[PDB]
Design a protein around this ligand. Structure first.
Ligand SMILES: [Zn+2]
Ligand SMILES: [Zn+2]
Ligand SMILES: [Zn+2]
Ligand SMILES: [Zn+2]
Lengths: 78, 105, 69, 94, 96, 96, 82, 104, 93, 69
DNA sequence: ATCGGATGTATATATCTGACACGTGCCTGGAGACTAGGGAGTAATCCCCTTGGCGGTTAAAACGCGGGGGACAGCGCGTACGTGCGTTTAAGCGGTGCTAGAGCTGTCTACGACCAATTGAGCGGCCTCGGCACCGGGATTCTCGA
DNA sequence: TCGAGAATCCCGGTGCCGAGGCCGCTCAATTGGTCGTAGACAGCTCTAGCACCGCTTAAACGCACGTACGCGCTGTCCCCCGCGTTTTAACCGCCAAGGGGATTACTCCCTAGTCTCCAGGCACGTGTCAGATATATACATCCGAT
């Protein structure tokens, strides 16, 4: 579940971002932020994959769902 | 029999663009010299980025462009960075930058 | 004399940027080694012209090195 | 079945600027998806201009004024200067 | 023995991760998380590998772009440590 | 010599101006500015009254919405006065 | 021609907008900073209205070109015939 | 001879929507049951906002609907505010609020 | 010439919820623009969504799912039901 | 008129190597932007004179760049 | 904390006009009825790809301890900003005049849709070798307690 | 100040699998006519955008004065970074089963298209009353002396 996003994994993203010191309460805040974004993308992906009477959500549905939210993504076709 | 692209002195295909404009429900009719204008723009933009990426592909002592070299081409120039402002290139990475307050004295 | 002026004119062409003929040569390109002024070079970089006026070799912004005297 | 892409034309363009330089599959797949994105924006903007003025044909003028509306600043000048030079060559050809 | 001053390792690892390019989160737990989240919309679904890869790439990009905006408003208060109030202020200003 | 504390009068103007709906800039001075700006793109141009009114109706909203977010960055730094370094940060975080 | 009309945006006029915004105290160096932000927002909008108004062969800006220009930047405006 | 909208039971026009949808360059063909479905959604949203506007006008002892009531009703409701996110209403105004720390 | 609008229909709907109020001409234009924007961006999603599936007709099913992708949360659950309840009546008669 | 004689000498010393006064400034240093002649450069590397004369700093093998004119 | 004086904010009654609501003429766009053909619904099938399970390495995660730098609170000072008053400037409103440009109407010609016949360009399948990945050794640079 | 120690870079050798070229083969772009409607052009009407002047008078402007707040400084203490040891499960390689995604025939009925007819929505005209404006009055609020 949501406990698979471990503290070193969270801190590596912060290091790439460019921070130098991290307070101890950050991880709990960021997990609940990521969980909200994933739901928003997946709901549209599932609606797209359900309109076409399919049973497997494909990569193009994810690409379209990302595209209509103001976030396009190159490198997966289309 | 020559091709329209060769007659117009281009590299991109004009007939395919003409067909794509028609079969796209954009307008009822399509003018004659619209594809020959639209295909000359798609090629200049491609030649710009493929020229800006070859310098990055050489500064790292490589001879084959990879997505990381395209990432550094559209982020180091205002004109292209403002056009691709909301695009996430896969396997791109970030641009090296450290705030000046963080460094030691 | 004319020869004294000619050498003055000949050396004048060497100190000033050929494009501008108003400022001392200040900016040099690593790729070709040619030296021009900093002011004339920058406006070219904003005009999307990355070819050397002299040796025609392509260059980029990072290949710009300042020179002194 | 058949599938169409600009992978053959991008490679031809690349060998005019950098005579000896390759390109990997991921880079080709990105350069392929960038052209479609630009093409879908230019024509999509040009259609509304035709609809606004109660017209029915997309001629060369709408493309010119749609390029001048999307590309930022100094790119538009070069794009227009490169398009209007290809059109005149095409129209006075064989 | 031998020790390092607090901060040098942080700076060198910053320099390290801003030069590489692979994914930072482990793959199998993220796949499990996606499969669990998707269960509340329609049961008995299937996923392609490319869909999970695209989801991971988008999530990484979003989180990386947000951690570099919270840092810029952490400095504004003459401070060098990021905080949940900084994150909340950044999210509020961005317009969520 | 009946004066007021420094701020009790400014605290009332907020209530006064958050309840009325009207333009806050002078019409002729604003209209001259548009004509001055729009004579570089193309000379000898003409405007409708509605065009000027619609151009003015949007700048009010833009400036008002910008002054709301720069008041949060000043609160974040334990202040009540807004300095020019807040307008830059608020404008940079939303990307412009 | 007309020049230096940017000084028509007066200090009380700027402060009245901040009052509606909600601030309480205003620093001295805010007016010059703010006058440079409104002069940039009015170029992007007008450069598109002028582009619209000359593709139609007209030589007068209408109230629809402004609405279209504002819509093209994600700032749709209701009330003027949009 | 009955109208196409009275059969469905709506107040909005079905034929006008059909001809507007069949002439805006959307698709090559338009199904028969599409305008009936679309003209029933357009009617619900307008009533939804026009009830809140009426209540807001009534709370101010007025008997008409000036643009301020529209803005109040839109900004006071979460779903409507989210739907009408990046849109501005002329002569609208602003929702009254003051930061808690600023008060004495 | 003439020009079309939704004025009469909006007034007819208004006299159903509040039978004793009126509306000003300046707010009428706002109400007329809102219904043109919503209809424009609902029917613009169906044409693109039918192109993905290599179809040629936009039917009621392409709109039932285009409504679900725009209206947030509670609003969609009511709009879908009211749209569905209207087609059944029309088909029967 | 000595008025333009001084300019030529000022021009001459600018382009001539300040060390030998016999060669053009055709070998510049990448580290600090100074320019000298190739004649006076490699003689210093014989004794490992990595310290530049003007600003007195060290250098390397890739810090010497060929320049023209 | 407890009164008091002054100031700005609600509260109640004329009056008066300009915009809202309603009525009528008329014309064009929407409703009926019938026809033909192509898009879409349905059945069969086959083969790729997704799910599930098993065993070994080992790389990454978890836990604990020391201590030193950074977050935070309290004080003091002095410059910048709020408040009020008198004087000056230009905006707002009204009225008149003139003409440049928007909007509509009638011609007619050139340009783009449409169809039959050709052929060469671009796509699918296969080979191959060289650029890049990886590992083992020195050489140079960077940090910290003296 | 600079030596000990650890991290990082330049170089050489080995190997492998994906980019780059080649070939055969459909089917889509090219020629060549034909026709009918969209649009370019000339002319006319009339309206609304621009320019100018005179008269209030509301608001922008400059100045004096006081004080609340921003900023710099100092001190205590607690919590996050660095480093070592131990426990976990991620990752790689391998195997097998069957589901459903994609493809191909076949039919049938639902939407485009045309002609006819008439009532509904739009332009224009008119009454009248809801709210803006002014004025006298009641009261909540705030800063000071105590
Ligand atoms: Zn020069
Ligand atoms: Zn050169
Ligand atoms: Zn020398
Ligand atoms: Zn030097």
């Amino acid at each position: 579940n949501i406990q698979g996003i471990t503290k070193p994994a969270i801190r590596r993203l912060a290091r790439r971002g460019g921070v130098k010191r991290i307070s101890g309460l950050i991880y709990e805040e960021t997990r609940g932020v990521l969980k909200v974004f994933l739901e928003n993308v997946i709901r549209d992906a599932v609606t797209y994959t359900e309109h076409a009477k399919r049973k497997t959500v494909t990569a193009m549905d994810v690409v379209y769902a990302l595209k209509r939210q103001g976030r396009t993504l190159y490198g997966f076709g289309g | 029999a020559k091709t329209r692209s060769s007659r117009a002195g281009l590299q991109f295909p004009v007939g395919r663009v003409h067909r794509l404009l028609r079969k796209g429900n954009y307008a009822e009719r399509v003018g004659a010299g619209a594809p020959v204008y639209l295909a000359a723009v798609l090629e200049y933009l491609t030649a710009e980025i493929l020229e800006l990426a070859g310098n990055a592909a050489r500064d790292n002592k490589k001879t084959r462009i990879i997505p990381r070299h395209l990432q550094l081409a559209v982020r180091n120039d205002e004109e292209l960075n403002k056009l691709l402002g909301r695009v996430t290139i896969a396997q791109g990475g970030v641009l090296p930058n450290i705030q000046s307050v963080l460094l030691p004295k | 004399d004319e020869a004294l002026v000619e050498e003055l004119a000949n050396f004048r062409t060497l100190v000033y940027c050929s494009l501008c003929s108003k400022n001392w040569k200040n900016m040099a390109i690593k790729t070709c080694g040619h030296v021009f002024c900093e002011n004339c070079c920058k406006e070219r970089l904003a005009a999307r012209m990355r070819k050397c006026p002299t040796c025609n070799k392509a260059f980029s912004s990072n290949d710009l090195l300042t020179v002194h005297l | 079945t058949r599938k169409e892409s600009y992978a053959i034309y991008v490679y031809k363009v690349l060998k005019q600027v950098h005579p000896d330089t390759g390109i990997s599959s991921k880079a080709m797949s990105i350069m392929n998806s960038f052209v479609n994105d630009v093409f879908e924006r230019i024509a999509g903007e040009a259609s509304r201009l035709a609809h606004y003025n109660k017209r029915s044909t997309i001629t060369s003028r709408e493309i010119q004024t749609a390029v001048r509306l999307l590309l930022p600043g100094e790119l538009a000048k070069h794009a227009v200067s490169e398009g209007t030079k290809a059109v005149t060559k095409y129209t006075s050809a064989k | 023995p031998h020790r390092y001053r607090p901060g040098t390792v942080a700076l060198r690892e910053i320099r390290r991760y801003q030069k590489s390019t692979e994914l930072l989160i482990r793959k199998l737990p993220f796949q499990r998380l996606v499969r669990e989240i998707a269960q509340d919309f329609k049961t008995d679904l299937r996923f392609q590998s490319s869909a999970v890869m695209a989801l991971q790439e988008a999530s990484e990009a979003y989180l990386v772009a947000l951690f570099e905006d919270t840092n810029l408003c952490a400095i504004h208060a003459k401070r060098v440590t990021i905080m949940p109030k900084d994150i909340q202020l950044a999210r509020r200003i961005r317009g969520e």
